[PDB]
Design a protein around this ligand. Structure first.
Ligand SMILES: COC(=O)N[C@H](C(=O)NN(Cc1ccc(Br)cc1)C(=O)CC[C@@](O)(Cc1ccccc1)C(=O)N[C@H]1c2ccccc2C[C@H]1O)C(C)(C)C
Lengths: 99, 99
């Protein structure tokens, strides 16, 4: 589909059997979601944006569905103000910027 | 043009007669540039990102060219990690997300 930017590009995602709302974020290197449980091993990571850095848990090879499009990648979990779908997963669903 | 996201979507912008590198950021509601000089008066604005909120200076009706496309709008100036082109200007150049 084509998503305009008149409003925040929020979409429905399916992860860990749960339905959530997330932001298609081209300014984000990684994907980070609010506190939730995920399977497998994880390691700590610090990510930074405007305001500074926050500590998150890094889980790899996680299955995620964005608007019905399946993709697998690293998903970060921590105190993020909003769910963010970053470039690491946006590439997988073939998302591009156009103008 | 069409921009993929395998690498950060960095483009050249022109403001105040100078070229700068900036990130097309769909996750950003506003445009915020690293410390620089802009004309006119400014107003205070608090913007929140991953690490919390920061105080920035808000200048309005500023001429800024993005990838050759001319825009005129609000530009914030403050301690940002990188120059960020947000949705307020991405809408002016007709940018959309597609997949
Ligand atoms: C490794 O560095 C990253 O890529 N870090 C990401 C990040 O923070 N990216 N930042 C900016 C940034 C920092 C460093 C670099 Br090299 C590039 C880019 C954003 O602007 C987008 C997030 C976001 O859209 C998230 C968000 C938080 C709260 C509500 C909505 C969305 C952001 O902080 N957006 C805000 C913003 C940025 C600039 C101007 C105005 C605003 C208001 C929000 O939209 C992340 C992995 C931690 C998510």
């Amino acid at each position: 589909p084509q998503i305009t930017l008149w409003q925040r590009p929020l979409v429905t995602i399916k992860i860990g059997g749960q339905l959530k709302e997330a932001l298609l974020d081209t300014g984000a290197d990684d994907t980070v979601l609010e506190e939730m449980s995920l399977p497998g091993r994880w390691k700590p990571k610090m990510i930074g944006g405007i305001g500074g850095f926050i500590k998150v848990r890094q889980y790899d090879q996680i299955l995620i569905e964005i608007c019905g499009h399946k993709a697998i990648g690293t998903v970060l979990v921590g105190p993020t103000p909003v769910n963010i779908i970053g470039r690491n997963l946006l590439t997988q669903i073939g998302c591009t910027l156009n103008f």
